[PDB]
Structures are given as C-alpha cells and as structure tokens.
Tab-separated table of C-alpha atoms and ligand atoms in Angstrom:
chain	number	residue	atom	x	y	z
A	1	UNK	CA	-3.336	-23.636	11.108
A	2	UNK	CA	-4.296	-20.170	12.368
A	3	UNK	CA	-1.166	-18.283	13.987
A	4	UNK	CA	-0.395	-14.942	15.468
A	5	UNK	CA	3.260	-13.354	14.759
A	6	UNK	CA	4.238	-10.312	16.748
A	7	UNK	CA	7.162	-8.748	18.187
A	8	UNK	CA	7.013	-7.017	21.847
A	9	UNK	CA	9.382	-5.300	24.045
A	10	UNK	CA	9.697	-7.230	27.399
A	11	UNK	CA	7.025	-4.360	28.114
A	12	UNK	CA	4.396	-5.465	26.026
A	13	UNK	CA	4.479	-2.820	23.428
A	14	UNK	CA	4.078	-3.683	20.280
A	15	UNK	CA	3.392	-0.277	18.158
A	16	UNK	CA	3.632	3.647	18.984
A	17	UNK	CA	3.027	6.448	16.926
A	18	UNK	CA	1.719	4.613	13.683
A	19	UNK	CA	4.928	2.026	13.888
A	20	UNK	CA	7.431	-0.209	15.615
A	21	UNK	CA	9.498	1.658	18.010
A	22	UNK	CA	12.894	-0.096	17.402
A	23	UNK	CA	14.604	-1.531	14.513
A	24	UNK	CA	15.118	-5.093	14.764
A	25	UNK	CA	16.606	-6.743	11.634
A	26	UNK	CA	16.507	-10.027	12.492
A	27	UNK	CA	12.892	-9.715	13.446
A	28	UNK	CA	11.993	-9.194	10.129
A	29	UNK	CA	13.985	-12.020	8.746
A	30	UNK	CA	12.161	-13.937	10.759
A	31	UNK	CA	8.602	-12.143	9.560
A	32	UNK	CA	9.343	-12.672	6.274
A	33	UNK	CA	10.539	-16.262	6.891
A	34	UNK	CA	7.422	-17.236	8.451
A	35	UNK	CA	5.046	-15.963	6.035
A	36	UNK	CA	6.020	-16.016	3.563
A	37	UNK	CA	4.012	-17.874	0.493
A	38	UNK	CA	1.307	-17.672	3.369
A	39	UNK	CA	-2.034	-15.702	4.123
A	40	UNK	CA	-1.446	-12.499	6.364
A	41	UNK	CA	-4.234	-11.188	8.210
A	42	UNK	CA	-4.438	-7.667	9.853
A	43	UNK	CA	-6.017	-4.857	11.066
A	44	UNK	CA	-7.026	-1.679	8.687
A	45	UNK	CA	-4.155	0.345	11.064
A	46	UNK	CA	-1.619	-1.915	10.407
A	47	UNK	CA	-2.564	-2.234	6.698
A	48	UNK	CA	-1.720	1.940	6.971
A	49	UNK	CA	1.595	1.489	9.377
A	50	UNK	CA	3.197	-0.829	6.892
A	51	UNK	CA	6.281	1.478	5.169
A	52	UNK	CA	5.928	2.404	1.164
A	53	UNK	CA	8.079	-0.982	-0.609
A	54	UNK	CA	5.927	-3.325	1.791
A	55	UNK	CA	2.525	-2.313	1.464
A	56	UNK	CA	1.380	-5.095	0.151
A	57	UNK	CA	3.698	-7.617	1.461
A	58	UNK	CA	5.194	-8.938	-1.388
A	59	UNK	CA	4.597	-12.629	-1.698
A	60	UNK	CA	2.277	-13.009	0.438
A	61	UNK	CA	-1.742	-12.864	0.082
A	62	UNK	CA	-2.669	-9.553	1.900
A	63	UNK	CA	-6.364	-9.539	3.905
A	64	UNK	CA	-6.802	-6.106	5.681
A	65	UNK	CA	-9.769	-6.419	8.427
A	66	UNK	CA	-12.297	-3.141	8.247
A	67	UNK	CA	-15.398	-1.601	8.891
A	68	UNK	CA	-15.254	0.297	6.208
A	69	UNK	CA	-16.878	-1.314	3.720
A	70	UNK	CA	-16.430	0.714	0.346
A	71	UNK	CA	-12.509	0.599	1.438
A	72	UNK	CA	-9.745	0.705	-1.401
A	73	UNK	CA	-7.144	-1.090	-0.567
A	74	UNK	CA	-5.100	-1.822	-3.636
A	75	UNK	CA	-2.749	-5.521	-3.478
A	76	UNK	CA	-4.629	-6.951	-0.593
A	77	UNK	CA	-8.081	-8.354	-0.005
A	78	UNK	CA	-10.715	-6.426	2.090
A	79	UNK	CA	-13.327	-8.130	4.731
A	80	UNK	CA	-15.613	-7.033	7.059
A	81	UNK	CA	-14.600	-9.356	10.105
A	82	UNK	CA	-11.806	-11.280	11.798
A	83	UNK	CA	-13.992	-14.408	10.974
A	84	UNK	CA	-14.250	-13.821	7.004
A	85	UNK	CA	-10.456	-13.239	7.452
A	86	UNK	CA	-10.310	-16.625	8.729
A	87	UNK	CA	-12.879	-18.288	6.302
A	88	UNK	CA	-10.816	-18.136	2.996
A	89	UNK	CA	-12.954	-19.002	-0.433
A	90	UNK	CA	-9.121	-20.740	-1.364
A	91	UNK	CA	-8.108	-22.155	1.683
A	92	UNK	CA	-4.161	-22.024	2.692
A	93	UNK	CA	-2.151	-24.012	4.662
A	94	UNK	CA	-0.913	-21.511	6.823
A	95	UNK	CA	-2.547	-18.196	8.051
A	96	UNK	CA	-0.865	-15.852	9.819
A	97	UNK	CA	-2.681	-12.817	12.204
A	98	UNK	CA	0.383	-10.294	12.108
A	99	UNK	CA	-1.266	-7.139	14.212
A	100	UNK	CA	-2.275	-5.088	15.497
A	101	UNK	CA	-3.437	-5.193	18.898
A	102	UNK	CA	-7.181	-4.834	18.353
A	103	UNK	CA	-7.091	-8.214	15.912
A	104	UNK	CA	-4.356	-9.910	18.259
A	105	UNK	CA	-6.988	-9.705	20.600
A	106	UNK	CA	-10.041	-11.102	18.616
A	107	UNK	CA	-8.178	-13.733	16.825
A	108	UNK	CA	-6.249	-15.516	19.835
A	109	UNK	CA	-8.835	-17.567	20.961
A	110	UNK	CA	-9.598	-18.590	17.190
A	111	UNK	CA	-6.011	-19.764	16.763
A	112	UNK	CA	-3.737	-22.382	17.790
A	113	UNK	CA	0.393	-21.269	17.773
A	114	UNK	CA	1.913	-17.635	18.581
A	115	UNK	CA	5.456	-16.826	17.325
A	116	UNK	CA	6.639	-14.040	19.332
A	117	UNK	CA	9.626	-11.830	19.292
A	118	UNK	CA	10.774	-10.263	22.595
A	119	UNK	CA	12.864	-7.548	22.514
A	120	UNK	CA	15.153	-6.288	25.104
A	121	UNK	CA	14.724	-2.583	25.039
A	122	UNK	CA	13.181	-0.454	27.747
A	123	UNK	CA	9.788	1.241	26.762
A	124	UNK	CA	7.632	2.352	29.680
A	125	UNK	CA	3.937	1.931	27.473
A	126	UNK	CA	2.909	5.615	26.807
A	127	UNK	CA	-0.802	5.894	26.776
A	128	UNK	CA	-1.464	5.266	23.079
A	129	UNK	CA	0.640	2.192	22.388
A	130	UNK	CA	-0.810	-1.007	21.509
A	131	UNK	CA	0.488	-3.619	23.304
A	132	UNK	CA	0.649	-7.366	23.165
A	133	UNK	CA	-1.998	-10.015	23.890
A	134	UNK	CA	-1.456	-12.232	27.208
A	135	UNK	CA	-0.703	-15.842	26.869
A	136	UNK	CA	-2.405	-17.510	29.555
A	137	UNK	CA	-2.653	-21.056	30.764
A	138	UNK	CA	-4.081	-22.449	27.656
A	139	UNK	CA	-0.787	-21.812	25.407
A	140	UNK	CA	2.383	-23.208	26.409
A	141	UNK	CA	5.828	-22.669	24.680
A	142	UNK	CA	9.203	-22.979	24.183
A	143	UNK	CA	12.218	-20.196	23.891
A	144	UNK	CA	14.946	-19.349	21.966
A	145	UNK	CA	18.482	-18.391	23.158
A	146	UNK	CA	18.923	-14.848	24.120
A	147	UNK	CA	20.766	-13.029	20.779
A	148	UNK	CA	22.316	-10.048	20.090
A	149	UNK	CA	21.150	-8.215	17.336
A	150	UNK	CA	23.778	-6.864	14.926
A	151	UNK	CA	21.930	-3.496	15.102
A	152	UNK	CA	22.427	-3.794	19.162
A	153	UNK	CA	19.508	-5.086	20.724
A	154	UNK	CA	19.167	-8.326	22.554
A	155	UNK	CA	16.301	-10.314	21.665
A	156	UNK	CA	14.766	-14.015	21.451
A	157	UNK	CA	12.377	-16.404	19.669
A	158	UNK	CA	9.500	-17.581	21.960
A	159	UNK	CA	7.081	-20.404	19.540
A	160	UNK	CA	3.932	-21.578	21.598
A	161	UNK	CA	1.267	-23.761	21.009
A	162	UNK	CA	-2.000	-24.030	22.388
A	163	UNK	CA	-2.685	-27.180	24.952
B	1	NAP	N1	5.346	-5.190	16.731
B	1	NAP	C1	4.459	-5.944	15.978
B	1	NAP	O1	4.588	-7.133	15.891
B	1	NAP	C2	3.357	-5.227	15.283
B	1	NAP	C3	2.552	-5.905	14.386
B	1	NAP	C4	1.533	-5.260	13.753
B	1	NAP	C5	1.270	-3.921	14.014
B	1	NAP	N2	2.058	-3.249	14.913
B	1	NAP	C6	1.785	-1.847	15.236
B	1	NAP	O2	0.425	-1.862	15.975
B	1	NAP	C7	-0.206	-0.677	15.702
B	1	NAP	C8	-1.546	-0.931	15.002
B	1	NAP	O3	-2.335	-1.732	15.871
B	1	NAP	P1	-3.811	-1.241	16.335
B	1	NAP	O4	-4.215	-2.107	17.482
B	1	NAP	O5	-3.855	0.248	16.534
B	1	NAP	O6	-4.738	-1.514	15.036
B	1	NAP	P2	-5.082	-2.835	14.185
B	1	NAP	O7	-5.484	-3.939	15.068
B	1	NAP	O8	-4.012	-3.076	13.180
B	1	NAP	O9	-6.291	-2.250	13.316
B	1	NAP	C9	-7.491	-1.820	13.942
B	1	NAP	C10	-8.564	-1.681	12.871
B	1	NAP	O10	-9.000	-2.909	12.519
B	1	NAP	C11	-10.470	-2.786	12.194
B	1	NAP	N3	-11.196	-3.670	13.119
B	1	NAP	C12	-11.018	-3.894	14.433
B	1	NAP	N4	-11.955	-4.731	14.895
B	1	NAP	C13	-12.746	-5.025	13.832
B	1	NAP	C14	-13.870	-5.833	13.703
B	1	NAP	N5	-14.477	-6.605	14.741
B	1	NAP	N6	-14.447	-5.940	12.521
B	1	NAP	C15	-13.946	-5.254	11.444
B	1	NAP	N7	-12.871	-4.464	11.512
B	1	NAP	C16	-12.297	-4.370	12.738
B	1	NAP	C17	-10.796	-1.439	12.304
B	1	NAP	O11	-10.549	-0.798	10.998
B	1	NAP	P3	-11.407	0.489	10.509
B	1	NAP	O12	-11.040	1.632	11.453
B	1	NAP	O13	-10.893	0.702	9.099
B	1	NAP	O14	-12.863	0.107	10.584
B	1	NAP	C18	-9.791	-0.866	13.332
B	1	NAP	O15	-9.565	0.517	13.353
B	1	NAP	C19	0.771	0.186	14.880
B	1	NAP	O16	1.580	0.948	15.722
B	1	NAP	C20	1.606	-0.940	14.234
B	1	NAP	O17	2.883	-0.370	13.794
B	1	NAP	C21	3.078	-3.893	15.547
B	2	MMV	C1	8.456	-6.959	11.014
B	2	MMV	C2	7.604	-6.535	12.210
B	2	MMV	C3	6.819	-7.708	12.737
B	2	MMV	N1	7.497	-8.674	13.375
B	2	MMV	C4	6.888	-9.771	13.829
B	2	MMV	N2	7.664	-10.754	14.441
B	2	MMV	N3	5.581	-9.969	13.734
B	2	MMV	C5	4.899	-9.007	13.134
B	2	MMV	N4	3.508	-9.214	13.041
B	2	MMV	C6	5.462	-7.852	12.597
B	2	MMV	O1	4.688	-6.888	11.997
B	2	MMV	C7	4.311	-7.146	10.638
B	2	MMV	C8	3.643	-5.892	10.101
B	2	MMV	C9	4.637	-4.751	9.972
B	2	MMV	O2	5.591	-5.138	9.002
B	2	MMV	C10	6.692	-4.356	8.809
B	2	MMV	C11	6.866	-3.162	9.507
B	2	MMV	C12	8.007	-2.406	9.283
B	2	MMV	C13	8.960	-2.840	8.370
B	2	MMV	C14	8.770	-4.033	7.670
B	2	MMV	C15	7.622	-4.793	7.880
B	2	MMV	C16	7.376	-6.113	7.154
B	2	MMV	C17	7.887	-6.111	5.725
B	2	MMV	C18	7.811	-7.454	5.022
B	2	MMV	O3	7.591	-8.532	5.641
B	2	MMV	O4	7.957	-7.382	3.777
C-alpha cells in the first residue's frame, strides 16, 4: 500500500515560507498515528522544513527524494527518484508520501489511498505556497465529522481510496 498524508486549508495550501502555516495539534496526532512504524517518503524541501526534535521522524524509516546525489542526510535514506522511493530493497507494509507538493504530485498516480486533513482557516495562496494535489474522479472517499481543535481551529478527517 502506497499512501499520501497531507494536511490543507480548505484553500489548498499546504506549506508557506519553509513550513505549515497553522498549528494543528490534532493533525499531528493523527501524522504520527498513521505512520508510524511505517516508511515515510518526501521531498529534499520537506526533509529541510521538518523542525529540530523531528528531523528524522523518530520511529519511522526516513527516505528523502533528491537530485542531489552526494547529499548528507543523516537518520534517513537518500534516492534519486520518487520510483526508488517506492521500490524498497526491505519491503514494508505501509508507505506513506507525506509532502511536499512537488512529490504529492509525482506519486498520486503511483498510489492507491490519500488521508487528508482539511483545515478551516482562511489563507488566500500567496504566490510561493505549495498547495495540495487534486483528487479527481478516480479517488473516492469518505469524511470525518467537522471538530474543533483545542488550539481553535475547526478541522476534519477526509480517507479516500482509489476506484
Ligand atoms: N501540510 C502538509 O501536509 C505538508 C506536508 C509536507 C510538506 N509541507 C510543506 O510543503 C513545503 C515543501 O514542499 P515543496 O513542494 O516545496 O517541496 P518537496 O516536494 O518537499 O521537495 C522538492 C524537492 O524534491 C526533489 N525532487 C523533486 N522532484 C524530484 C525528482 N523527479 N527526482 C528527484 N528529486 C526530486 C528535489 O530536491 P533537490 O532540490 O534536493 O534536488 C526538489 O527540490 C514546505 O512548506 C513544507 O512545510 C506541508
Ligand atoms: C504534521 C504535519 C502533516 N500532517 C499531515 N496530516 N500530513 C503530513 N504529511 C504532514 O507533514 C509531515 C511533515 C512535516 O511534519 C511536521 C511538521 C511540523 C511539526 C511536526 C511534524 C511531524 C513530526 C512527527 O511526526 O514526529
């Protein structure tokens, strides 16, 4: 099973200046829930955006997707391509894409569920935010209730498969 994780404002942003532009507890209960004891997958700019105490993830096997070949990139695994990312020489059960928006991009056709976090707060996109894939017709899916964080914001589960 190859999944992608993300959390979006009802915008589509996912990411502004180097980070997440909220703070959503319960969105990273959930995170962490999910993966881990699982495979995480990401781009070489997430890999940079994650804070100090989480870079590597802790429990989690860490592959960071670059061109950069000679890259150090110490606690997680480096490859050259969304596919070697996805071709494991110790397979896992579970592998989960977590960002950003340039390997959202390549690896949703490659995968079969998206666990997505929508949060309610208002972020016109600003012209360097990454923003969330598009699930079209071929994924279909099923929603949480609408919560309230207890940090303030409302937000809700969506899980969706691919048909
Ligand atoms: N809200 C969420 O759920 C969430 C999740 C994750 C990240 N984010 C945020 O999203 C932003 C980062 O996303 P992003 O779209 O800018 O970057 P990204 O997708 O994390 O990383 C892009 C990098 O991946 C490498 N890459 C891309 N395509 C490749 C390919 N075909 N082959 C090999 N390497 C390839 C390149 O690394 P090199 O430049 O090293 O070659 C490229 O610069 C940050 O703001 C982050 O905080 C949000
Ligand atoms: C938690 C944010 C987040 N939320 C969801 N639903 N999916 C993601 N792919 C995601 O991004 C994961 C990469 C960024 O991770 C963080 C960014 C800021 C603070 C903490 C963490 C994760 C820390 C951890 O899991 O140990």
């Amino acid at each position: 099973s190859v999944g992608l994780i993300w959390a979006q404002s009802t915008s589509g942003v996912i990411g502004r200046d180097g980070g997440i532009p909220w703070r959503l507890p319960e969105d990273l209960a959930h995170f962490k829930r999910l993966t881990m004891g699982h495979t995480v997958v990401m781009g070489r700019r997430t890999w940079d955006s994650l804070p100090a105490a989480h870079r590597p993830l802790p429990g989690r096997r860490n592959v960071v997707v670059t061109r950069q070949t000679g890259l150090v990139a110490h606690g997680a695994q480096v490859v050259g391509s969304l596919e070697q990312a996805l071709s494991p020489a110790e397979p896992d059960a579970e592998t989960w894409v977590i960002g950003g928006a340039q390997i959202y991009a390549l690896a949703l056709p490659l995968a079969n569920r998206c666990e997505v976090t929508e949060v309610d707060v208002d972020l016109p996109p600003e012209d360097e935010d990454a923003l969330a894939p598009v699930l079209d017709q071929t994924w279909a899916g099923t929603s949480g209730e609408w919560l309230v964080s207890r940090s303030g914001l409302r937000y809700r589960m969506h899980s969706y498969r691919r048909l």
